Amino acid sequence: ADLRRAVDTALSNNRSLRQALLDIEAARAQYRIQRADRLPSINANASGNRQRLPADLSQTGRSEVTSNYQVGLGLAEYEVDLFGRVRNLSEAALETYLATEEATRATQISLVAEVIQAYLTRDGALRRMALVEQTLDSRMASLELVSQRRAAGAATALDYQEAVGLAEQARAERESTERQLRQADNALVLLLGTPDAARLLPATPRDDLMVLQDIAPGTSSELIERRPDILASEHRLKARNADIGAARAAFFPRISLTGSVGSSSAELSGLFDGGSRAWSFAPTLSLPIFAGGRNRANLDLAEVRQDAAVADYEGTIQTAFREVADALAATDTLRREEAARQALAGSSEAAMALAKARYEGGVDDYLRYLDAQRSTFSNQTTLIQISTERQIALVDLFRSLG
Amino acid sequence: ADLRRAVDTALSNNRSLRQALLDIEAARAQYRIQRADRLPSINANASGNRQRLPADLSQTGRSEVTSNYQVGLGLAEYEVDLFGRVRNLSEAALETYLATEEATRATQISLVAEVIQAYLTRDGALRRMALVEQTLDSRMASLELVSQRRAAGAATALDYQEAVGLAEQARAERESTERQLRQADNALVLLLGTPDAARLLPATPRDDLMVLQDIAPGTSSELIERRPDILASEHRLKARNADIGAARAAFFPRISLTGSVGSSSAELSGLFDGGSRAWSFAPTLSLPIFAGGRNRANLDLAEVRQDAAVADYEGTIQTAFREVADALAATDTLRREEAARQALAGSSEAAMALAKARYEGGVDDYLRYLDAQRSTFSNQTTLIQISTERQIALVDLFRSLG
Amino acid sequence: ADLRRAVDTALSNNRSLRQALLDIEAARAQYRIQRADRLPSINANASGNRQRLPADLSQTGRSEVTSNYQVGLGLAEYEVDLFGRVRNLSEAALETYLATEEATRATQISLVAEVIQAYLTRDGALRRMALVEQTLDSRMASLELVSQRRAAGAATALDYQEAVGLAEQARAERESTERQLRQADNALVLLLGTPDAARLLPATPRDDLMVLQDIAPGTSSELIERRPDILASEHRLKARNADIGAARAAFFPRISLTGSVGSSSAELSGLFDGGSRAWSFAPTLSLPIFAGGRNRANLDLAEVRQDAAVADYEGTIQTAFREVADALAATDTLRREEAARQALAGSSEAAMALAKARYEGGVDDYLRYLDAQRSTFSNQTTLIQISTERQIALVDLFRSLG
């Protein structure tokens, strides 16, 4: 329940997700930029050229100056396309935008998985703190009791020293778990991206289930169509195919019309006089009859780049298969390992029942009971470690499946 | 033996390796592109310009219309190079291609190293599974025996509980080793890059020698001459020197030759008529007498980049030296460590022989013999871990030596 | 004291630091390139064009050939700016240079941190070697003593075997510590960057204070004003905020002045004749009245990029906060953990003193005294790991604080 709230807070507030969404907007931006090329590029051109062979003659000087002033609209190099290398670049940018969309979706999924994993780590750390704190209390009781035994003379100073060492070891273990818990809290507050994230998280552990325990892997073909990074690789491959199309179109002759319409006169005063509405059409065909590789090696470059995109697609698919298979193996083995560790914890708890029965029966002293307590609580905390690690493995499996 | 088969399968099928050779074909294509600039670049130009000062007059209107149609060949701004800045870019691309060749060779070497290391890890994991399976069988034997002793009343429930806990601990250990083995298989499958990779590997481990156990490091100068990434950095430094040459050439005047040949007429009907075989010839000397840093800042940028390439080359040399030194230290220490661990395993085996002699002699019960079994089994698997890690260290040493 | 010498050697000699400094020189050069655009770009242009409708007529042929030769200076497209898009690019280059300065400062401080951490690791490894060497000596002494006891028939071969195994385990531990020490030495010599770096480091550990033990974190705002990476992110944000200004200026009309001055003649002989001193001076107003998204998408791309820079700045702030919080938590918990471990080491020391008193008193065996020595040396060496890790945590806290 709180996982959903934390994930919502992250998606609303995490900075890396905002960066990814802005990458989305920028991909749309250059897609629009490239798409603008297909449409006419007409601009208002107001140019005045003063050219003359002798010197001086400024501001209507005494010479044969020709001062042309061309003011009007100009079609700035339209490229009508037989194959649409402009169009090829256009849907190449479109494929880049789609790949960016898939990549941002993958980043969102990864951020959610990190949030859940850090949450689970924090919960496990809280449980381990309860366990280690009460184990240190058990060691303190044992140390005090051995201290009384030595004071009464029934114990050597060596036993007091070893009890002191055991208490120190318990303190060091508690310090290590405290450090782990603080690191987990800081990681969570970073992932949530809000300075009040320490207020949105519960202060105590709970035994409530948080993530679904059984997840069906399905087939590899389904994973191909659902995992975002594979989709991103597919879209990049499509973009590289678009680049191959552009390179192929570059072979063929390119025809461009340069147009203009406006006024022109030999003097500035006649700029807005009748009879100067000039125009210029200039269709031009360029075709390199011998490229020398200038156009060909571009084609081979695009070809090999598309092949590299194919290889990248295959490699990403294989990596995703590797990752999901690892997650499945980890989840299965960890389910069995947690079953074994739960059986072990139950065994130590049975030892608790027996040792307590003996102690209350006056057969075993308090030292044996406390030793049993420490044993069972060590077993319980090494159970919590495995449970947390299994939950993290489940989250990784969910992330891998998309 | 099967290691070479796995390496062949990887080099034939690995997707990242195919990506590397595709990067080499791309780099070669890029060099071809840059080399095409040195050779003449002519193109067939067919242009028709129609211009007139008043408006309308479309399709031979009544005015002083000026229509020009030029159809023919044209040399598009040849740069006659006194310093060969085009040539400088040429062998800069060539050095980039050679550096990419060295980098791809290094990637192939790394792929081989990972394949070998993963395969060794799989072998060690198989041995560890044998070890842990028999350790768990020992634990269950002792558990059943203690269960019988409790049933007969000769043992407390505490002993039965601790035997249960030990069996659970062994089961958890077996689950951990199973997880490790599955992950190793998955990594090997990914490295081989084929869905049938599980058929190219043996289901059982072998004690045969696998990789050469002693490798001579030689001298540092040799490591400079053989290691592929060092060669890549050297070729990149040579490329940066060629860039410095190009920037120096940019200071000097450039001779730009532009020419054309074809037909020109005032009307469309007269394009293919006699007496229109026009031609152009326009050499140009572009030399910026005051660059303002436009050409000088390019220069110290190139010199700074060449110095940075020098620093990178030295840093890569030092990194390779660190890697080979680390690999040598690891190999030596691990040889001695495996000697110690083999001595320890032999010691546990001798203790096994003595405990078995006692048990068959009727002096020690079965529990002591089973305890000796578990002890020797743990020692033997700790030996296998060191042996596997030493093999991995040898492979890392080979990889770092090129 | 030797830390200052080592870090000075690093800054003088480390190849990655020299790489960063050459990166600053490159960034300064790239800014000089961009700043050169604001200033006039004049060009000594010497061009000769020969064009005529019929064929042949080369070298003063018999036709209407026109041979125009222009030799002289030329102002190559001065862009007088109403908003300063060139000025905006200059500001962007300056911001990039400042960001690179902060990044290089960050690389320097990180290099210092790694040098100090490696040096601390080397010192701790030396202490651990002393400890493990004497632990192994104790194991060999116990092994010899048990061997002599067995030879006299007072011990079973089982005790000899277990003593042998213990000695082997101690040897394996010694090999592991030797490997760690060698790796630390190699890392240190790589960080220092000189072949004679191992000459510059002492071969013995020392107990003096090494870095300041208490460091005050201060406020978050102060860290915002001191950490180099956050300053680099701020400068990159400023660069993008100049890019958005450049894109905004791209909307507005831009004026270019193309000028020239020199000689013109219809024949080569008359190039240096009187009255040929010609010139041209040509306003051009370029303004796209209908961009079609060509400029508008550039504008929103700049907006999106600046927003992404804002997100980057915030994310880096949060990352720095996470790092300093982790460092503080680690330092505090590690201070308490080292206190506990020192108490434990003192406890084992007192236990060894008691065991020695008993042994010299003839009550305890030499085996008991040797075991007490081994226990105290194990506690003392596990103290050194905590102390070294605490020192490394302090260095990390210093690094994260800038």
Coordinates of N, CA, C and O in Angstrom, one line a residue, chain B residues 290-298, chain C residues 28-42 78 86 89-90 93:
Chain B
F290 N 43.7 38.4 -41.1 CA 43.5 38.5 -39.6 C 42.4 37.5 -39.3 O 41.3 37.7 -39.6
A291 N 42.8 36.5 -38.6 CA 41.9 35.4 -38.2 C 41.0 35.8 -37.1 O 39.8 35.5 -37.0
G292 N 41.6 36.6 -36.1 CA 40.9 36.9 -34.9 C 40.7 35.7 -34.0 O 39.8 35.7 -33.1
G293 N 41.5 34.6 -34.1 CA 41.4 33.4 -33.4 C 40.5 32.4 -34.1 O 40.5 31.2 -33.7
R294 N 39.8 32.7 -35.1 CA 39.0 31.8 -35.9 C 39.9 30.6 -36.4 O 39.4 29.5 -36.4
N295 N 41.1 30.9 -36.8 CA 42.0 29.9 -37.3 C 43.1 29.6 -36.2 O 43.6 28.5 -36.3
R296 N 43.4 30.5 -35.3 CA 44.4 30.2 -34.3 C 43.9 29.4 -33.2 O 44.6 28.5 -32.7
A297 N 42.7 29.7 -32.7 CA 42.1 28.9 -31.7 C 41.8 27.4 -32.1 O 42.0 26.5 -31.3
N298 N 41.5 27.2 -33.4 CA 41.5 25.9 -33.9 C 42.8 25.2 -33.7 O 42.9 24.0 -33.4
Chain C
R28 N 38.9 26.1 -23.0 CA 39.2 27.5 -23.2 C 39.4 27.8 -24.7 O 39.0 28.8 -25.2
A29 N 40.1 26.8 -25.4 CA 40.3 27.0 -26.8 C 39.0 27.1 -27.6 O 38.8 27.8 -28.5
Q30 N 38.0 26.2 -27.2 CA 36.7 26.1 -27.9 C 36.0 27.4 -27.6 O 35.3 28.0 -28.5
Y31 N 36.1 28.0 -26.4 CA 35.5 29.3 -26.1 C 36.2 30.4 -26.9 O 35.5 31.3 -27.4
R32 N 37.5 30.3 -27.1 CA 38.2 31.3 -27.9 C 37.7 31.2 -29.4 O 37.5 32.3 -30.0
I33 N 37.5 30.0 -29.8 CA 36.9 29.8 -31.2 C 35.6 30.5 -31.2 O 35.3 31.3 -32.2
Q34 N 34.7 30.3 -30.3 CA 33.3 30.9 -30.3 C 33.4 32.4 -30.2 O 32.6 33.1 -30.9
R35 N 34.3 32.9 -29.4 CA 34.4 34.3 -29.2 C 35.0 35.0 -30.4 O 34.6 36.2 -30.7
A36 N 35.8 34.3 -31.2 CA 36.3 34.9 -32.4 C 35.2 35.2 -33.4 O 35.4 36.1 -34.3
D37 N 34.0 34.6 -33.3 CA 32.9 34.9 -34.2 C 32.3 36.3 -34.1 O 31.8 36.8 -35.1
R38 N 32.4 36.9 -32.9 CA 31.9 38.2 -32.7 C 32.6 39.3 -33.4 O 32.0 40.3 -33.9
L39 N 33.9 39.1 -33.6 CA 34.9 40.0 -34.2 C 34.8 39.8 -35.7 O 34.4 38.8 -36.2
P40 N 35.3 40.8 -36.5 CA 35.2 40.7 -38.0 C 36.0 39.6 -38.5 O 37.0 39.2 -37.9
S41 N 35.5 39.0 -39.6 CA 36.2 37.9 -40.3 C 36.5 38.3 -41.7 O 35.7 38.1 -42.6
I42 N 37.6 39.0 -41.9 CA 38.1 39.5 -43.2 C 38.9 38.4 -43.9 O 39.4 37.5 -43.2
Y78 N 29.9 39.6 -42.0 CA 29.7 40.2 -40.7 C 28.2 40.1 -40.3 O 27.3 40.6 -41.1
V86 N 25.3 35.6 -31.7 CA 26.7 35.3 -31.6 C 27.2 35.6 -30.1 O 28.0 34.8 -29.6
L89 N 26.1 32.7 -28.1 CA 27.0 31.6 -28.2 C 28.3 31.8 -27.5 O 28.9 30.8 -26.9
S90 N 28.8 33.0 -27.4 CA 30.0 33.3 -26.7 C 29.8 33.1 -25.2 O 30.6 32.5 -24.5
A93 N 29.8 29.4 -24.6 CA 31.1 28.8 -24.5 C 31.8 29.2 -23.2 O 32.5 28.3 -22.7

